[PDB]
Design a binder for this molecule. Structure first.
Ligand SMILES: [Zn+2]
Length: 128
């Protein structure tokens, strides 16, 4: 099931993300709308492209904690987090709290207090 480092198998991971990536809102990158994104920020439970993933990787884990859904190891709780999150829930939250000019391309959401607040909404879902 789960290895000594606390990671699910590559196969369980594969079966999980193949489904969750196919959810319609998850089929375009959260930041730039590039199609079929396979990278992710665990923090906001959003899927992002290989291009936007590099930008996120320069920000630092407290801002955005980046993994490849294709390649990286995941713990079981990180899968649940991706499952209850997704691009649709995040877009919905941010368009409300950041408004009509919500512009995920700049990743302003990631460093924002609103970003922190959404990250905590997700923490609360997976913890209580
Ligand atoms: Zn992108």
């Amino acid at each position: 099931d789960v290895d000594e480092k606390g990671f699910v198998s590559d196969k369980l991971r594969d079966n999980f993300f193949q489904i969750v990536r196919n959810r319609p809102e998850n089929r375009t990158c959260f930041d730039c709308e590039s199609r079929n994104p396979t990278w992710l920020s665990l923090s906001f439970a959003v899927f992002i492209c290989l291009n936007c993933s590099s930008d996120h990787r320069k920000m630092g884990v407290h801002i955005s904690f980046v993994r490849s859904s294709d390649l990286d190891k995941f713990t079981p709780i990180q899968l649940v987090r991706m499952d209850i999150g997704g691009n649709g829930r995040a877009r919905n939250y941010f368009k409300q709290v950041l408004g009509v000019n919500f512009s995920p391309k700049t990743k302003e959401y990631a460093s924002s207090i609103c970003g922190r607040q959404y990250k905590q909404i997700l923490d609360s879902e997976i913890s209580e």
